[PDB]
Write a protein that binds this ligand. Sequence first.
Ligand SMILES: Cc1cccc(Nc2cc(Cl)nc(SCC(=O)O)n2)c1C
Ligand SMILES: Cc1cccc(Nc2cc(Cl)nc(SCC(=O)O)n2)c1C
Lengths: 251, 277
Amino acid sequence: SMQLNPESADLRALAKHLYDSYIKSFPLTKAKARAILTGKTTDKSPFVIYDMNSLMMGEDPLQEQSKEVAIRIFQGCQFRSVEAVQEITEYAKSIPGFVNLDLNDQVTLLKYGVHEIIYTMLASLMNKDGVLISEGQGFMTREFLKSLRKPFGDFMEPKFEFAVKFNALELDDSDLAIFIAVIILSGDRPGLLNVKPIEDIQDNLLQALELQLKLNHPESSQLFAKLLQKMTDLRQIVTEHVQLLQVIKKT
Amino acid sequence: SMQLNPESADLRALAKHLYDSYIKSFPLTKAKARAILTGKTTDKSPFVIYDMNSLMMGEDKIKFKHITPLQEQSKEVAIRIFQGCQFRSVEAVQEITEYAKSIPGFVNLDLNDQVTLLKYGVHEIIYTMLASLMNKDGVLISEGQGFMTREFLKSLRKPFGDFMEPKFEFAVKFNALELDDSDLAIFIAVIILSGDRPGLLNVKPIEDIQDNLLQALELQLKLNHPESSQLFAKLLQKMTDLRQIVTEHVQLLQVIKKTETDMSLHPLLQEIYKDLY
Ligand SMILES: Cc1cccc(Nc2cc(Cl)nc(SCC(=O)O)n2)c1C
Ligand SMILES: Cc1cccc(Nc2cc(Cl)nc(SCC(=O)O)n2)c1C
């Protein structure tokens, strides 16, 4: 049980702040994405890329223009990944305390954070069938991405695997805003000078998260613990990504 | 706020069960170790290894239990000490396996899954419990009979000098949570019953057991640490640290593996050198 007091009020105020910021930083929210994936909004009718024929109809710089469909698609992911770092960096700047940190720690926390957030928010854009691309204008199937020649055909599978289990938590934009902020303010990132001040902020964010998950998910056993376990999955996934980016890099 | 009801009583019964199993499987508890490290018990007065002189007096006055067989008997102090760690690691697996067998549900699982969970879990439990034996200054060895300093371990020739540092780094942050044996019994049982281990067939039944254990843990941490912010969350975050720590251990065991005949032939070569030149 809880009480409505000044402490619980400030954690609600903190949660509202992060959501309004999330909304300003992230154009394609989970609510928007779920609406497109379930046919509800007329606004977007994404083109479905499910095979080589629809990939060609689908597209419709100069010296990285490759014949190999696998190359063009991996360059799409790379461009959107740079865009996603901008959005996350904008979000990060609205987390109370975060700019009052050593400019050094700031770039550190972001350096290891972005890949964890990308994967977290990639789940928002995914169902069983595939993933929204180009702000909900395109939809690329899981199986088409699997069909790409090795090792590109193995690139997104682990992301799909993550998303199925993560989307079963049934988190909304309010849940995700606080979760994403908890990820960024991670004490245990290599090379940080001032750890305590990052930790004191995360303790507040973890409190805000616990309060948000209790209020927002009345029918949910250990959703806080199941969410914090996911931060372990995400580390493992980044490791597997990096190892694959460095097999692709080599050949 | 909570209620004392049948559900909360089953969770306290489950915690009591795990503690009494932990006391049975783990001869040197944190409570015993803290008592040695603070000088309270006269029972153990550990011999302190802090330099090559005390290491030599150390092997003869500690009866390590771990008798290194005749033909892996190295001159290189670094070799003998790593072989010490290796023998105590095998011993630690026996103790964890025994503990594992008492976690309700754990034996009702595919014998395959049982071996999987233990296969990845022992490395995480070893680090967890090594913290129990550590302070700022070093680590208890041979069931509290010795104490080897952090700095003496760092002083050993590369790469052996880098072997325990990460364990000290982890222990410092983990020991600041101030967990006791009750807390650790449930935390260790949570780690073993991890759904996400490569190669498990039946995930759900492991997940169902772990959800009960995470409930028992939350209740134990609330009742046992009244003055502690988000201790449950901070404990779960440690379970992420341990993955990264094990990855670093394993990579170092495989740099040692590659160069193991090469490093214990430096002494006999050092003799041939000063004999010739
Ligand atoms: C153009 C294109 C082709 C194939 C896949 C994807 N999606 C990706 C891939 C990666 Cl690695 N990262 C992202 S960022 C997801 C988001 O936060 O919107 N989006 C995109 C956007
Ligand atoms: C000879 C020596 C030197 C340094 C450390 C240790 N002890 C270790 C080493 C390792 Cl890798 N693992 C353990 S398990 C800790 C426990 O519960 O006793 N104990 C030992 C036995």
